[PDB]
Amino acid sequence: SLQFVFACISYAVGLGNVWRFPYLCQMYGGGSFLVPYIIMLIVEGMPLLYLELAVGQRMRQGSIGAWRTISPYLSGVGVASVVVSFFLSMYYNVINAWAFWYLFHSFQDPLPWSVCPLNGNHTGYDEECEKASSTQYFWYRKTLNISPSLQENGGVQWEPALCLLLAWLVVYLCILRGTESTGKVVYFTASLPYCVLIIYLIRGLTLHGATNGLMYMFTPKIEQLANPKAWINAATQIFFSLGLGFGSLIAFASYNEPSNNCQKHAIIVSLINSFTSIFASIVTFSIYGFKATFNYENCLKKVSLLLTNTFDLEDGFLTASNLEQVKGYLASAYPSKYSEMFPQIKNCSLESELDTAVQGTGLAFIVYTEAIKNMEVSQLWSVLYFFMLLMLGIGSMLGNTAAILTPLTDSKIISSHLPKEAISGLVCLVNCAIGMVFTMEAGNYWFDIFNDYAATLSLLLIVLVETIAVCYVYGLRRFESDLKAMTGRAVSWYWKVMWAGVSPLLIVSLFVFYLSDYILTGTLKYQAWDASQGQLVTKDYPAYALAVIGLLVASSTMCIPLAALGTFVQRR
Amino acid sequence: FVGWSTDWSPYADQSIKVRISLKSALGDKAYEWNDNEMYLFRSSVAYAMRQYFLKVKNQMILFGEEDVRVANLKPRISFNFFVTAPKNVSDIIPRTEVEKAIRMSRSRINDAFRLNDNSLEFLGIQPTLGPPNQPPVSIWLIVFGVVMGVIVVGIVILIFTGIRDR
Ligand SMILES: *[C@@H]1O[C@H](CO)[C@@H](O[C@@H]2O[C@H](CO)[C@@H](O[C@@H]3O[C@H](CO)[C@@H](O)[C@H](O)[C@@H]3O)[C@H](O)[C@H]2NC(C)=O)[C@H](O)[C@H]1NC(C)=O
Ligand SMILES: *[C@@H]1O[C@H](CO)[C@@H](O)[C@H](O)[C@H]1NC(C)=O
Ligand SMILES: *[C@@H]1O[C@H](CO)[C@@H](O)[C@H](O)[C@H]1NC(C)=O
Ligand SMILES: *[C@H]1O[C@H](CO)[C@@H](O)[C@H](O)[C@H]1NC(C)=O
Ligand SMILES: O=C(O)[C@@H]1CCCCN1
């Protein structure tokens, strides 16, 4: 039991828990995103994960083998579940590359994200490095060198290309080296992320204004709770973090005994995944709240300094506790002078800073580099954190690439011509060569596209097709009888209810709501960095970016009906 | 132009404006800016002028605390000073020389009042923080090269052993 449970945990717990969940929570309102998540975990996560594990046991075959033995007209859903993994493995590694970068720039006393470069007079700081933060400047310019718009792209940045090449070499080495020696690793790789997150929580809960971050995280704003995109993203993140639809959970459960409790194991795996995501996001949002409080305090200090240098007030007379009253007093004293700079006086509040302090796919890196820069020995904590992140990414990618490669190895047509060491080498080479598009100047936008559409909605349609197949085509009574004969205990009525009607209906409703929202809006937008404004602006997707967005989902989803049509043609 | 303005003054062109922020740079334990502190500041400025005229122009000029004329004192501790000749009131040291003198010996003036270039602003004399040194070439590149080399060696040896075993 321990072996299977820890294998599933090591697969599920990855960068989707530590990296994707925090910025997804920040983007969709914090609490306004956390309430659907839990709501989407009881209905979609547990029942469908249990269904996958039971199909893995009762078939005791691979994903393609299982979905072909249930019915030939359905074999395509085994092929599509591979293709999605492909796209995932196409871009996921980029994240690991970034971590490598952040690791290699961690053996310097003047940490690159700690101090802004000099302006050029050697008297001040850079304009964009001052308008943004040092961490944000490092992430958006020194790391990605992000172009202001998707239409503007340069050449392949050689440093990110080398980092991605190194990450793929490490993945290939891990593939070749070990396949069953995870004995002590499971004892080690499952506790190190928790230890590092505990350390960063210990630092993260003693910073000034950490409760602001926690309050933002846990406040369920009803106004933005009605957004269908929040529900869609919650469901898709649940599916992407549990691994549902990738087809490797079925393979993992295929090697388990049929006299095993998959009701306990599914519940435990889902709860552990949820708890890890919540803990990592709690630490991240505590640091994020510290950042927002610091920005608010800095703005208040700047406004106070502006007023003091002009009205010739005392050094400490104008504080944050008597600002408006003194502003009114100054306005009442003489309006002629106040009229000149009234545009210049800026309004800042904690709420707006909390929404727009840091946002995007680099939220984890920026937040954690800021936290590191506020440590005592910053280098050691940076190495430890970006090594935990490297281990998580490498484990998740080992799982994903095993899911990719097992169908290829199992095919005797290819296995009779080239060694598995060459099949794996070719797969890694193809993935690394195609993933160079994420290292361009405008590569972060393509990474945004793949992170939001490559393995987002196809996982919903795949799981919907799988559950309809299990319930209605195979026959839920026959499946329940088979499972009861296998394990002695019949499936609970709650699991049957969630399998048959509730989860597919909720998935269909989510799809309908998303489609209706997209049609009504009629303008898909993406975030783009603005160095002159030093923040993020919304820009409409160009014509050619929608073709790729459509194709990424369309190929994987439509691989099922095409296979059904081919089978019908073959029969006739 | 008929009329006059109550802001022009014959000394207003050569005045250097000082702004001091005690409470920010010291927080608590900050002294009060009474006339003794003004005396010390004028003595410091006169000393700076003496140093500049001795170490640059090689002239011995006996400036004094009464040769640093101070106007428009305000509670913010923001005023205008200008330095005249040692005993020739009609002669005003031009502002450029005063600025060079202050740049030369700004460290001593800062140390006299325990201020650092941000609480003691001369409004026209912008300090230089200092160039940021760069390492020999790149530490990240060296670490990346080492890691890539060891990974490549591991991959090669594993492939060779796997091929040789079969
Ligand atoms: C105090 O400093 C002032 C300068 O601010 C000295 O005034 C300067 O005196 C010299 C000597 O007379 C002047 O040069 C002369 O100018 C006249 C004007 O045409 C010319 O006829 C002479 O041949 C000679 O070039 C200089 O112009 C004058 N500067 C100013 C601004 O008035 C003054 O002498 C100093 N007092 C003492 C006691 O040294
Ligand atoms: C500092 O550089 C800016 C350009 O960003 C320039 O406008 C300014 O005059 C410079 N300051 C000095 C003292 O030269
Ligand atoms: C700040 O608030 C005032 C009053 O609400 C408003 O007139 C002004 O446009 C706001 N923004 C700035 C930059 O002053
Ligand atoms: C900044 O530069 C000036 C000369 O340009 C130099 O005198 C000063 O000491 C520098 N500041 C430092 C090194 O802190
Ligand atoms: O938690 C993760 O990062 C991985 C992503 C791939 C599916 C399994 N979970």
Curated annotation (Swiss-Prot), chain A:
Example GO BP: amino acid transport
The gene coding this protein: SLC6A20
Source organism: Homo sapiens (Human)
All ranges on the Extracellular side of the membrane: 17-32, 91-155, 206-231, 288-379, 443-455, 516-544
Topology relative to the membrane: Multi-pass membrane protein
Protein name: Sodium- and chloride-dependent transporter XTRP3
GO function term, MF aspect, one: amino acid transmembrane transporter activity
GO CC, one annotated term: plasma membrane
Entry comment describing in which tissues the protein is expressed: Kidney and small intestine. Expressed in the S3 segment of the proximal tubule. Expressed in neurons.
Transmembrane intervals: 1-16, 33-53, 70-90, 156-176, 185-205, 232-252, 267-287, 380-400, 422-442, 456-476, 495-515, 545-565
Associated pathology: Hyperglycinuria: A condition characterized by excess of glycine in the urine. In some cases it is associated with renal colic and renal oxalate stones.
Stretches in topological domain Cytoplasmic: 54-69, 177-184, 253-266, 401-421, 477-494
Ribosomal protein keyword on record: no
Swiss-Prot record, chain B:
Substitution effect: residue 1 to T: No effect on interaction with SARS-CoV spike glycoprotein
Positions annotated with a glycan in the UniProt record: 88
UniProt region (Essential for cleavage by TMPRSS11D and TMPRSS2), positions on chain: 95-114
Localization of this protein: Cell membrane; Cytoplasm; Cell projection, Cilium; Apical cell membrane
Post-translational modification: Proteolytic cleavage by ADAM17 generates a secreted form. Also cleaved by serine proteases: TMPRSS2, TMPRSS11D and HPN/TMPRSS1. Phosphorylated.
Domain Collectrin-like: 12-166
Tissue: Expressed in endothelial cells from small and large arteries, and in arterial smooth muscle cells (at protein level). Expressed in enterocytes of the small intestine, Leydig cells and Sertoli cells (at protein level). Expressed in the renal proximal tubule and the small intestine (at protein level). Expressed in heart, kidney, testis, and gastrointestinal system (at protein level). In lung, expressed at low levels in some alveolar type 2 cells, the expression seems to be individual-specific (at protein level). Expressed in nasal epithelial cells (at protein level).
Membrane-crossing segments per the record: 139-159
Region entry Essential for cleavage by ADAM17, spans: 50-57
Applied biotechnology uses: An engeneered stable, dimeric and secreted receptor with combined mutations that increase the affinity for human coronavirus SARS-CoV-2 spike protein shows potent SARS-CoV and SARS-CoV-2 neutralization in vitro.
Induction trigger: Up-regulated in failing heart. Expression is induced by IFNA and IFNG. Exposure to cigarette smoke increases expression in lungs. Expression is decreased in nasal and bronchial epithelium of individuals with allergy after allergen challenge. IL13 stimulation decreases expression in nasal and bronchial epithelium. (Microbial infection) In airway epithelial cells, expression is increased upon influenza A virus infection.
UniProt similarity note: Belongs to the peptidase M2 family.
Swiss-Prot/TrEMBL domain comment: The extracellular region of the ACE2 enzyme is composed of two domains. The first is a zinc metallopeptidase domain (residues 19-611). The second domain is located at the C-terminus (residues 612-740) and is 48% identical to human collectrin.
Assembly, per entry: Homodimer. Interacts with the catalytically active form of TMPRSS2. Interacts with SLC6A19; this interaction is essential for expression and function of SLC6A19 in intestine. Interacts with ITGA5:ITGB1. Interacts (via PDZ-binding motif) with NHERF1 (via PDZ domains); the interaction may enhance ACE2 membrane residence. (Microbial infection) Interacts with SARS coronavirus/SARS-CoV spike protein.
Name this polypeptide is given: Angiotensin-converting enzyme 2
Organism: Homo sapiens (Human)
Gene: ACE2
Residues of the full protein shown: 603 to 768 of 805
